[PDB]
Amino acid sequence: MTYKLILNGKTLKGETTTEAVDAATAEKVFKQYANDNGVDGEWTYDDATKTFTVTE
């Protein structure tokens, strides 16, 4: 299934998508991806829209 991530960094703003067998895998992929971009904040997930949102 396709999961979408919205990035609301103070200076980093963007969005991206990825394929994952379930949301549990999305947490590891987006979390590592966000870490590689130096993004840390509160993580929220919407099962209805399968969209992960992180706010710094």
Show me where the domains of the chain are located.
1-56
d(CA 17, CA 7): 11
Specify the experimental method: NMR
**CATH number assigned to the domain covering 1-56:** 3.10.20.10
Among residues 25, 29, 56, 32, the alpha carbon closest in space to that of 43 is found at 56
Between CA 21 and CA 13 the distance in angstroms is 26
